[PDB]
Write a protein that holds these residues in place. Structure first.
Motif, PDB file in Angstrom:
ATOM      1  N   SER A   9       5.318   7.646   1.766  1.00 60.21           N
ATOM      2  CA  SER A   9       4.823   7.129   0.501  1.00 60.21           C
ATOM      3  C   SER A   9       4.449   8.268  -0.434  1.00 60.21           C
ATOM      4  O   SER A   9       3.969   9.312   0.008  1.00 60.21           O
ATOM      5  N   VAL A  10       4.736   8.086  -1.718  1.00 60.71           N
ATOM      6  CA  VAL A  10       4.416   9.088  -2.728  1.00 60.71           C
ATOM      7  C   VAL A  10       3.955   8.414  -4.015  1.00 60.71           C
ATOM      8  O   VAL A  10       3.837   9.063  -5.060  1.00 60.71           O
ATOM      9  N   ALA A  11       3.812   7.092  -3.961  1.00 63.10           N
ATOM     10  CA  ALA A  11       3.345   6.328  -5.109  1.00 63.10           C
ATOM     11  C   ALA A  11       2.507   5.120  -4.702  1.00 63.10           C
ATOM     12  O   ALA A  11       2.554   4.672  -3.556  1.00 63.10           O
ATOM     13  N   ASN A  12       1.637   4.700  -5.613  1.00 64.25           N
ATOM     14  CA  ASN A  12       0.794   3.530  -5.413  1.00 64.25           C
ATOM     15  C   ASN A  12       0.761   2.710  -6.697  1.00 64.25           C
ATOM     16  O   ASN A  12       1.011   3.235  -7.783  1.00 64.25           O
ATOM     17  N   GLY A  33       0.804  -1.219   0.000  1.00 61.79           N
ATOM     18  CA  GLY A  33       0.000   0.000   0.000  1.00 61.79           C
ATOM     19  C   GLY A  33       0.836   1.267   0.000  1.00 61.79           C
ATOM     20  O   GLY A  33       0.452   2.276   0.595  1.00 61.79           O
TER      21      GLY A  33
HETATM   22  C1  NAG Z   1      -2.337   4.294  -1.690  1.00 59.91           C
HETATM   23  O1  NAG Z   1      -3.615   3.691  -1.716  1.00 59.91           O
HETATM   24  C2  NAG Z   1      -4.121   3.390  -0.430  1.00 59.91           C
HETATM   25  C3  NAG Z   1      -5.444   2.640  -0.564  1.00 59.91           C
HETATM   26  O2  NAG Z   1      -6.044   2.938  -1.808  1.00 59.91           O
HETATM   27  C4  NAG Z   1      -4.297   4.674   0.379  1.00 59.91           C
HETATM   28  O3  NAG Z   1      -4.727   4.369   1.688  1.00 59.91           O
HETATM   29  C5  NAG Z   1      -2.989   5.451   0.436  1.00 59.91           C
HETATM   30  O4  NAG Z   1      -3.205   6.700   1.056  1.00 59.91           O
HETATM   31  C6  NAG Z   1      -2.425   5.639  -0.969  1.00 59.91           C
HETATM   32  N1  NAG Z   1      -1.123   6.280  -0.898  1.00 59.91           N
HETATM   33  C7  NAG Z   1      -0.742   7.224  -1.759  1.00 59.91           C
HETATM   34  C8  NAG Z   1       0.602   7.846  -1.517  1.00 59.91           C
HETATM   35  O5  NAG Z   1      -1.411   7.561  -2.735  1.00 59.91           O
END
Ligand code: NAG
Length: 220
Positions: free
Chosen positions: A105-108, A81
């Motif tokens: 985090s900065v990517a998904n 995640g």
């Molecule tokens: C990534 O996706 C998750 C669930 O969709 C979310 O909780 C999280 O904030 C997202 N992180 C970013 C950096 O977009």
């Protein structure tokens, strides 16, 4: 359909990196494709942490500086995640314990897709989607020494690839062309290698070096 594509000019691509002495190319290929799709999505080019992948993505099948798959990387970003920025989790060229931090985090990603084994499909996919993670037989001294031009290596294999790279597009040579067509490939051996870190590589020459045998990219 374009007879040329260069994703570097459309803002999809970060500056060339260097994996140093660590079998982590799978991780530079992965971040490269994830950097691209994150840009398509948000219009923001943020450099992504390879060390994060090296340190943390074992449970998905990766073995650190001992090697790995791009697909496994995309799988980890999903399971996990998120993935930390380059800034927040800098590259160290050795395997350490996992230091991921959801705050940074900065990517998904959301899955990945595998292009079938066709330089035709791989032409399509570059054109449609973004830069593409691919694997190549790099295990020849001509690849070590490459300086410019369009790379062709008679002893290159199309089945046994050993090194992950990034197709950021394709061109052609000769105001025409059957011949001479090239893939535009970003490597992770520093800017001092190849053409400031890039390599033009034979395209539609019987899947040269297997550039199409293992292509893929992350869905977002
Ligand atoms: C990534 O996706 C998750 C669930 O969709 C979310 O909780 C999280 O904030 C997202 N992180 C970013 C950096 O977009």
């Amino acid at each position: 359909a374009p007879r040329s594509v260069d994703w570097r000019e459309k803002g999809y691509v970060t500056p060339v990196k260097n994996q140093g002495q660590c079998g982590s190319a799978w991780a530079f290929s992965a971040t490269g494709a994830l950097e691209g799709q994150m840009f398509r999505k948000t219009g923001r080019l943020i450099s992504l942490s390879e060390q994060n992948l090296v340190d943390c993505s074992g449970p998905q099948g990766n073995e650190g500086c001992n090697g790995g798959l791009m697909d496994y990387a995309f799988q980890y970003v999903q399971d996990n995640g998120g993935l930390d920025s380059e800034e927040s989790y800098p590259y160290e060229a050795t395997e350490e314990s996992c230091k991921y931090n959801p705050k940074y985090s900065v990517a998904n990603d959301t899955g990945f897709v595998d292009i079938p084994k066709q330089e035709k499909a791989l032409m399509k996919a570059v054109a449609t989607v973004g830069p593409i993670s691919v694997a190549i037989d790099a295990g020849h001294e001509s690849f070590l020494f490459y300086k410019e031009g369009i790379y062709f290596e008679p002893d290159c294999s199309s089945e046994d690839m050993d090194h992950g790279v990034l197709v950021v597009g394709y061109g052609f040579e000769s105001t025409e062309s059957d011949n001479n067509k090239y893939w535009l490939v970003k490597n992770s051996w520093g800017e001092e290698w190849g053409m400031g870190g890039y390599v033009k590589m034979a395209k539609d020459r019987r899947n040269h070096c297997g550039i199409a045998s293992a292509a893929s990219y992350p869905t977002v």
